[PDB]
Structure 1
Amino acid sequence: TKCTLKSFTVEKGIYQTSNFRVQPTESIVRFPNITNLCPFGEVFNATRF
C-alpha cells in the first residue's frame, strides 16, 4: 500500500493496491505426438545408389 500510493505514511481506510510480489515462472513446451515419418529409412539404407 505504501509504495502503490507513493508515500511512506498511510491514512485510515481500505486501499486497493497493485501487485509487486513477483513469483518465479517455469517454462513448458507442448507439441502433438510425433507421427508421419519420411522415407529416409529406404533412402539412406537403399539397396543401390
Structure 2
Amino acid sequence: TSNFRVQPTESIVRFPNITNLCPFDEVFNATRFASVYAWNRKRISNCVAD
C-alpha cells in the first residue's frame, strides 16, 4: 500500500576552523590614519572573513 521512511529528527552542519584570523582591528582601530586625498588601500585576502 505504501512505503515506510523514517524522517530525521534534527539537522547538524560542520565546517572547518576559522583560521588566518582576518585582520580587521588594525584598519578599524589605528593610532594614525591617512588623508582624504592620499588614502591608503588595504586588501584582505587568503583568509576567511569574520
* Greater relative CO (CA pairs within 8 A, separation 6+): 2
The structure carrying a bigger strand percent of its residues is: 1
> TM-score, normalised on structure 2?
0.46
